[PDB]
Amino acid sequence: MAIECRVCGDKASGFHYGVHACEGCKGFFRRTIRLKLIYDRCDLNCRIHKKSRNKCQYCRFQKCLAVGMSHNAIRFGRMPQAEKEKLLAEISSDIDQLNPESADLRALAKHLYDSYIKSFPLTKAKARAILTGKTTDKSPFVIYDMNSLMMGEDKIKFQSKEVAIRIFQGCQFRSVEAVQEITEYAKSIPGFVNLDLNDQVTLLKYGVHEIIYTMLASLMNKDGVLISEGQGFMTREFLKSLRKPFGDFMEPKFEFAVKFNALELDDSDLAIFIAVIILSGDRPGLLNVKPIEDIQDNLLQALELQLKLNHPESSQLFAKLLQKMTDLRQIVTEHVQLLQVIKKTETDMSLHPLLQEIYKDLY
């Protein structure tokens, strides 16, 4: 009931020129003919998906023509017998993909996804609408200095301590909420609640951190970061500007985020990857390991298949995304050696009592 295009793979806007095409190709074609445009030649068989589409006018006006697309078969009217293909793409070819064991891996993938959507508000989906401007929302109030901060710090307010100290002390409640969401998501992972409640806590103590930066990257980009529900946008440059130890606090995350975003993982993909982090049998303080590792085994199984299906063409991504689990560990240990510095040279730290618990005896 929600098919896609046959030339680039974007969502199809309808049956145009005898073939399901996006409102984008439909126009490209109707304009090639309309103006007789004769796009220069090119041999390289050019893959054609959502973004590469406008990469080569010849291969695009090729592929479409190579799968119907005729100023003839334009079948007007109302869809007469949807049924025939109202069983979506994989219909009879589904009792082949919606099976065998993977049918369930597919299920798990969905569960964790559908659960991820109910656990965290601002999904990657949204944050991207905002950072791409393709939303019927107001551009987030950008915060690049003291004047903009002093200003928006009132616009949407809920203690004058210090700019550098307000910036980070004041986000502590999001970290907390964040931690609260992750946790409720953790329970949605088949078999988490069952694991000895003692390791259950351990798996989180060490999980949230890494899961936080993974989420915290969806909201980020090379130039800044989304905030306040995604109605604000602090700049990378401004933050980099904070005093003494507070400027190089969010840096490590931007670097990481710029790289992690290269994989181009969506919510469907991130919903599982995340689950894999919480279930890492290599966490200190675990004794009921096997169990913990069994799930990761199956979650990973699910993850891998999800990357193949979702991102058909992306060499070693599964192996590439796992490599990220290693950058995450560094970020956290690094982030802690910092919050240690603060503890010794500052006098206002006063961490929330929950961030307090997690950080205690971490690394």
Binding site: T183, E184, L354, I358
Partner: peptide, 10 residues
């Protein structure tokens, strides 16, 4: 042991 909390609450 304040996580035990959130973990032990529907």
């Amino acid at each position: 042991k304040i996580l035990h909390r959130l973990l032990q609450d529907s």
